[PDB]
Structure formats: C-alpha cells, structure tokens
C-alpha cells in the first residue's frame, strides 16, 4: 500500500556518491522506509531539439533528470545546488538544501610543487580550469600565471598533472574532492580575496515535483537552516542580476554574530572589469521547525515550509539589495558583454 521512494541518479561516480549520501541521511530519519535507487542514462537528443539556445553537455544532464521527475519515473533527484538554475520550470522545486560542505575553490599542484601556493608558483606557470568564473577571478588576481582550459574528467585532470608536462596546477571545487575521499590532494584552499566561489557551491539540493506534498514532507527533514539561508541570499543575488548562465558571478556568505554577510561580484571574462561589494543583515539561524502553509510561494526555487519564513524572506532581500547595488555600478554592462563573448561557441 505504501509508496516506495524512487531516487533517480546520474551514472557518474560523484553523482552516485552524492545520491547515496542523501539516501543514507533520509534512512537515518526514516528507518525501514523503502527507497529504490534508479540510475538513468538516456541520450538526450530530444531536449537539444526543443532548445532555442545552446545547452551544453552538463546542463543537458540536469534536464534529463527533471524529465524523469515530470514523467513520474522517480520521486526525487540529488544535484549539486550550483547546477540548478535560479529559475526552475514551474512543476519542480528544491525541497531540501543539505548542510553545506566546504564551498571554496581549491588548487591541486603538480607533484614537484608541494608546499607551493598560486602566489609562489614561477611566473608563466600554466594552471588548468574550464570555469569562466574561476578564470576571470584568477586572471585578475594572478596576472603572471596562465590560465588554460583542461579537458577530461577528474581522473584525467589528475593523470595529466602527475604524468605530463603542461600544467603546474589545476583549480576545482574542494567539495568534489572531499566527496571522492581525495581531500589529501588539496594543496591550497582559495580565500575570497583570491577566488570567491560559485553561487550554491558545496551544498546539495534535492529536486522534487512542486506539488508532491508527501515527498516534500519527507525531504524537508534534510533542510539545514544556516545553509538554506545562505543559499537563498546567494541565489536571490544571482537571480536579480539577470545575467545569462555561466558568466562570471561569485559570492561569499557567512552567518556569525547574529548577522548574515553576503559579498558578491561580477567580472569580465578576462578579469579586467569587475565590481564587488558586501552587505549584511541581522538574521539569526532559526532553531525551531514549523508547519507553514502549502500556499506559501517558493523562494528562488526552494520550498522550505518547515523552516520559519521571516528569515528566508530577509535572506532573499539581502541578495536583492546587493544585486541592485552592483547594477547601479554597471554590472549589467559587464554581464552583457561577457554573455555575448561566451555566446561565440
Ligand atoms: C542560467 C544558469 N544555469 C545554471 C546551471 C549551471 N550551473 C553551473 C555551475 C558549474 N557547475 C560546474 C560543475 C560542477 N558541479 C558541481 C561540482 C562540484 C562542486 C559542488 O558540488 O558544488 C562541479 C565541479 C567543480 O566545480 O569542481 C562548474 C565548473 C565548470 C564545469 O565543470 O562545467 C560550474 C561553473 C563554476 O563553478 O564557475 C553552470 C556552468 C557550467 C560551466 O562550466 O559553464 C551552469 C550552466 C551550464 O551548465 O551551462 C545556473 C546556476 C549557477 C549557480 O547557481 O551557481 C544558472 C544561473 C541563473 O539562473 O542565473
């Protein structure tokens, strides 16, 4: 008579690990409840057909899992929160924001360079990254290094670094290496003054059907209030800038002393044009849960009716406030130019 909770996952190693970690946490709250993990790999030729824009191989993967949700083949999927756009299709929502892992970008160094930092690499060292945000910030901070795209999966990146002669280092998210059990490869954790992280980096988001109240009820136990509020602010900031996908936008948040701090910035692709500012608001981390009404609208794609709504609205307002500041200083022109340049391919 029950529902069996079907959990859809991509087939990549990191996605499978993330999915299973969320399932384990759910089973800890709901022992005996039946879960079924369903791995999906279907070639998404039909989603590219309907697209009026270039999608990209990664963005295609997210759309494929929403298709599984829409067709009632699975009941929830687990994403890195930074892979979920700030505007979701109307039938979907993020029903859980899990406790954040390390949000910072990290450096892995060529083995001859143990003990080094980007600051102490030889001039003209070649550093691999395929992220426009990382390349923009790091080119500005480190004008005497060379930042180049690097092809392949993580295992290929690390093999190229250990075996070949091109790259002195690579940049990637600390959280990915953490989840791979490979934190011992990290040689430097980048601070906001070197490289601020992507909106939502390090948090997992659970996507579900927007009106599937039974599943929303179950997964709401996963919401971490502090991570929820930080990520609402980061995503509201990004949404309100109204830039395209991918262009260089980065953030830093902290909740401390009863305050929520949000730093946000935009960069041209080469890093030479930038605007960054910090704002704060008095918001404390709620310790109580609640049973908010089903009519409450989601906030930047997130349904968290069991967490007090006042602080969520305040976090959203902080992000909007900071976006409006950046826009009054010319952020739209920086974002538009970056989008047009990145639309060349
Ligand atoms: C319009 C619009 N679209 C999107 C979806 C979207 N997100 C990104 C961010 C992204 N993702 C990755 C790959 C990655 N994902 C998770 C990890 C591990 C760390 C973690 O769990 O947080 C990784 C790898 C890693 O960082 O080490 C990257 C890295 C580059 C890559 O492999 O593709 C990034 C970019 C970055 O961090 O700077 C993207 C961009 C992907 C790209 O490289 O261009 C996209 C769009 C796409 O797939 O084309 C968003 C959400 C962005 C956000 O919230 O951060 C938006 C924003 C909007 O609505 O305005």
Residue numbers in the entry: 17 to 361
Copy out sentences from the published article reporting this entry, exactly as the authors wrote them:
Porphobilinogen deaminase (PBGD; EC 2.5.1.61), also known as hydroxymethylbilane synthase (HMBS), is the third enzyme in the heme biosynthetic pathway. PBGD catalyzes four consecutive reactions to convert porphobilinogen (PBG) into hydroxymethylbilane (HMB), a linear tetrapyrrole heme precursor. The holoenzyme (Eholo) carries a dipyrromethane (DPM) cofactor, which is covalently linked to a conserved cysteine residue (Cys261 in hPBGD) through a thioether bond (Song et al., 2009). Mutations in the HMBS gene are associated with a genetic metabolic disorder known as acute intermittent porphyria (AIP), giving reduced heme production and severe metabolic and neurological symptoms (Bonkovsky et al., 2019).
The structure of the mutant R173W-hPBGD agrees with the ESI FT-ICR MS analysis, representing only ES2 in its reduced form (denoted R173W-ES2) and thus revealing for the first time an AIP-associated mutant trapped in a reaction intermediate state. The incorporation of S1 and S2 in R173W-ES2 causes a major rearrangement in the cofactor-binding loop Leu257–Val263 including Cys261 to which the reaction intermediate is covalently bound. In contrast to wt-Eholo, the active-site loop Ser57–Lys74 in R173W-ES2 is reoriented toward the C-terminal helix, α33, allowing the accommodation of the additional pyrrole rings in the active site cleft between the domains 1 and 2. Because of this rearrangement, the new pyrrole rings S1 and S2 take the original places of the C1 and C2 rings of the DPM cofactor in the wt-Eholo structure. The created cavity is not filled by the relocated C1 and C2 rings, and in the structure, a glycerol molecule occupies the space between C1 and the protein core. In R173W-ES2 presented here, the active-site loop is oriented in a significantly different conformation, partially facing away from the surface with Lys74 establishing several interactions with C2 and S1. Trp173 has different side chain conformations in the two subunits and has two alternative conformations in subunit A. We also discovered rearrangement in the helix α22 (residues 170–179) in subunit B. This rearrangement allows Trp173 to adopt a completely different conformation than seen in subunit A. From this point forward, we will only discuss the structure of subunit A, unless otherwise stated. The conformational change seen in subunit B of the R173W-ES2 structure, where the bulky tryptophan residue turns away from the active site forcing a change in the domain structure, probably also affects the loss in thermal stability. The substitution of Arg173 with tryptophan introduces a large hydrophobic amino acid, predicted to hinder the cofactor and/or substrate interaction severely. Both ESI FT-ICR MS and X-ray crystallography show that this mutant accumulates the ES2 intermediate with a greatly reduced turnover.
